[PDB]
Amino acid sequence: SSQIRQNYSTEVEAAVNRLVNLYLRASYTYLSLGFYFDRDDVALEGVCHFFRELAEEKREGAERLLKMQNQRGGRALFQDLQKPSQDEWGTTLDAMKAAIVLEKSLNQALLDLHALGSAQADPHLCDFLESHFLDEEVKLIKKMGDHLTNIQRLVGSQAGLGEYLFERLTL
Amino acid sequence: SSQIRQNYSTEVEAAVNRLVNLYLRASYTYLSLGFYFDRDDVALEGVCHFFRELAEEKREGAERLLKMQNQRGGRALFQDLQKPSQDEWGTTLDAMKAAIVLEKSLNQALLDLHALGSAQADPHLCDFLESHFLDEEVKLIKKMGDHLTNIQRLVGSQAGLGEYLFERLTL
Amino acid sequence: SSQIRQNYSTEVEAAVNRLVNLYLRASYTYLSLGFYFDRDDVALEGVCHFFRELAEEKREGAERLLKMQNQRGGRALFQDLQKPSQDEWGTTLDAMKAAIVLEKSLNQALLDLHALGSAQADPHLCDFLESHFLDEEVKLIKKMGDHLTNIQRLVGSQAGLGEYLFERLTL
Amino acid sequence: SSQIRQNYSTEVEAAVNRLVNLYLRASYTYLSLGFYFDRDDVALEGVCHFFRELAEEKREGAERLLKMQNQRGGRALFQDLQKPSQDEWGTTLDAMKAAIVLEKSLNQALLDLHALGSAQADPHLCDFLESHFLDEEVKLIKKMGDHLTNIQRLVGSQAGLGEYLFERLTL
Amino acid sequence: SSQIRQNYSTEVEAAVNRLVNLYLRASYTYLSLGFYFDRDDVALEGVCHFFRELAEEKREGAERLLKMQNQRGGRALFQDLQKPSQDEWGTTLDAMKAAIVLEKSLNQALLDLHALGSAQADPHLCDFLESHFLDEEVKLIKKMGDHLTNIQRLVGSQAGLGEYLFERLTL
Amino acid sequence: SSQIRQNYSTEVEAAVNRLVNLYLRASYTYLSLGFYFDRDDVALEGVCHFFRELAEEKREGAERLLKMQNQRGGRALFQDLQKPSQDEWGTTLDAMKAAIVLEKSLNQALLDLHALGSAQADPHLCDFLESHFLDEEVKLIKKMGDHLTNIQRLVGSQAGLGEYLFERLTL
Numbered sequence A, B, C, D, E, F: 001s002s003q004i005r006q007n008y009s010t011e012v013e014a015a016v017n018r019l020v021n022l023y024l025r026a027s028y029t030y031l032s033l034g035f036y037f038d039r040d041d042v043a044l045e046g047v048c049h050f051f052r053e054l055a056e057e058k059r060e061g062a063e064r065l066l067k068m069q070n071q072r073g074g075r076a077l078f079q080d081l082q083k084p085s086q087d088e089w090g091t092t093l094d095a096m097k098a099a100i101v102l103e104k105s106l107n108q109a110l111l112d113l114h115a116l117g118s119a120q121a122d123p124h125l126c127d128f129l130e131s132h133f134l135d136e137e138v139k140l141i142k143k144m145g146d147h148l149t150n151i152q153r154l155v156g157s158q159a160g161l162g163e164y165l166f167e168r169l170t171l
């Protein structure tokens, strides 16, 4: 019996906890992506930095969700964190394709939560997502899309050259 | 067939990957501890801050291990991350007792790795642990021990008072 | 009969003198590598600078060893310095392959000295190597490994182009 | 039953307490050396300053040992402190010969402790000594050795002159 | 046969040497007090700092006495230094009671020396003590007395609470 | 078939390579001289510094020659570097006598090269030597000559005293 809880459904509380798991999973995926590009046999520093900064962003998104859970009077509940889908991530192109899949999944989870909030008439939740998540995700996905296009135009008949140049001149 | 790998046993490589899992688990434990103390029905800001800063320290220790793995030519391999042992953490005293158990476990894992390194005649590993881990862990455990003692002296016949004062005047 | 010498075996003293010869040889190798890339028919300024800075590093490592020999009460003994293995060093790729061979040899000599120190129960020697040599060598070898990978991806079907780009955009 | 103590043998604990006694004894010896050179019938200010600064260094080394004892969960135990070996210290040459004997004894006690730590598989102790003691002692003994040589070359047929000049121009 | 000695009795010379022993003993007592409060099972940082600063003050008082001995043409003679009276010092209250006993003993030794000086018609000694010791001791004893009173009022029915608060809010 | 080579004889090219060997040999000699004076049983810091700075100067002279070889379109060719003539260098006087012998040999090699250049009508070579070498060598030899004279006047009947004073007051 929380003294502050008001207009905060058990459905939203549960879905926030699920979303925290999804963001921490994504953080973990990006940690693995980063360290893969730091391997001496991969050695793409800008690519490593791109993903390591996304691991931090996703961690921060989970903590924002956790703060909000406590502000609303819900209870944070943590579950096991699955490991990333792959141990090795291929080329930069392969990695950026996996990243945009991942971000699309996070975006769909945000949209689903927003729809739940709207069904539960929880405007504080709706505002929260609008303020801190939805535009961030659109912006990120757009950038990834721009990167994919630049990566793909650089493949040509000289894929290693293009992978180097992209890392050097964009990342 | 790594071009840089030299004097780096498969045994140490594997044990480093295990240690990364242990540090990320500990980070996750401290994240849960922090947010528990941020609950409106717990509300010990200094206690929340103490554990949130340890979550960051343990994450950083895992990334240092991961960097080193790549510097040696080993391969980072990630596993599932188990959730923390508890969902609710009791009093500050309960929490600090759990934290010192946790740190003792990390310290024993560092000592075991050092012993493995010494058995494998891997001085770079031995130096690494000595430089970045072993004294940090001793220092931390000492502080926790000092906190435990101060917490316990404050219990008296007025436990809530003592929990407040400790948070206000030490943390 | 040295007035300061304490716990410093003749075996270690001799092996330090040998190691000085190995570091001065390596310095000399890197001097030759540098000037080869400064030839008007080779003309890779960044490659020349990379090796000239390693010649200085290896010289500095020999002087550190010499200082330490005197601090321990051993006697510096110098031998002839053999010339480098090659007069011309090929491509940047050829040169970086020779450099990583060279650094692996230095690293193995450091590890052998550390093992000797450990057998002689000479912790000051062990600490010395750990403090000033072993991590430096690991770091260097990792960088060389990262460079090799980038060089090799740039070969493609356009090797001169890739050699230029690597020099311009990495070195 | 110490709550923080981990991997810290009673043997090392005891030997640390012994070492504290040895460092405080050495501090006391250097206090006596300093004040002897401040006598109006001795009057070598630079010599007085040299030893008074060593008294402070040895005190500081004992306090570092004491801090470490508490960090490990051992118990500091103090014993009587014997007075210095002499009441009057002769010439600067006599004094510097006594000082290098003293420092050799401290160095041997550090090496013995390191060997004990290594036998007990206590890497934190080994690192501690390596980090704060062993190189300091080697450096100090080297300087003393350099001073002895300069003092001895100045004896000539004019010992008072040489004692003055050394104090004026080196110390 | 000292060339500078004038109006300086053998009685005062001897009593100064005794007083140096008493001040160094007191320094040693305060070193032990300090480190006892730094134990993880005691853990009163402000109490540790209070006594460690007194160890330094008493050392400084011994060196002032030693300087003065040489200025007068007496001869410093050092004796064994007994260990402190206790290995463990109880509560802050116990420790402060021991400290004020100790300071009363030093003060009585200063007063006895002053009386000796007055009997020997040694005004330089009398002035020395008046200038650097007697008011310092009165001031110190007063502070200790103020601390004792505050400590004792805090015992109440909640002694641990009071010991914490005193350390936090006074020391 | 060098695209830039113009008026640069094979005779001069070869003699430049020889001169590089002579300068690197001299650098090596001065490295040995320096470290000999850093021995705890020799211990003449100013003498050590004098020779260590000459080792650097001679290295720099070899690199200038190597740069020039490439600017002219010649090919640097390195040979084995013989060790210095002595392992121990005696007194400062002995060492300064060896140094001036060494510098006279370098100066004669510069003059011989200049004469070769003049015979080959190579004014760029002549200017190079005039600009960067010949006056430097004259200046150096003059200083050494001034030092020798001061050293020799200090021998007297008190050679150690004079060796100390020279190191302290000139070097």
Ligand SMILES: [Cl-]
Pocket: A008, A009, A010, A011
């Ligand atoms: Cl609900």
Ligand SMILES: [Cl-]
Pocket: A057, A060
């Ligand atoms: Cl951010």
Ligand SMILES: [Cl-]
Pocket: A082, A083
């Ligand atoms: Cl999974």
Ligand SMILES: [Cl-]
Pocket: B008, B009, B010, B011
């Ligand atoms: Cl293996």
Ligand SMILES: [Cl-]
Pocket: B057, B060
């Ligand atoms: Cl940190």
Ligand SMILES: [Cl-]
Pocket: B082, B083
């Ligand atoms: Cl679990």
Ligand SMILES: [Cl-]
Pocket: C008, C009, C010, C011
């Ligand atoms: Cl030996």
Ligand SMILES: [Cl-]
Pocket: C057, C060
């Ligand atoms: Cl450097």
Ligand SMILES: [Cl-]
Pocket: C082, C083
């Ligand atoms: Cl050869």
Ligand SMILES: [Cl-]
Pocket: D008, D009, D010, D011
């Ligand atoms: Cl034990």
Ligand SMILES: [Cl-]
Pocket: D057, D060
């Ligand atoms: Cl210091």
Ligand SMILES: [Cl-]
Pocket: D082, D083
């Ligand atoms: Cl005794």
Ligand SMILES: [Cl-]
Pocket: E008, E009, E010, E011
């Ligand atoms: Cl008298």
Ligand SMILES: [Cl-]
Pocket: E057, E060
């Ligand atoms: Cl003071």
Ligand SMILES: [Cl-]
Pocket: E082, E083
């Ligand atoms: Cl006693």
Ligand SMILES: [Cl-]
Pocket: F008, F009, F010, F011
């Ligand atoms: Cl020709």
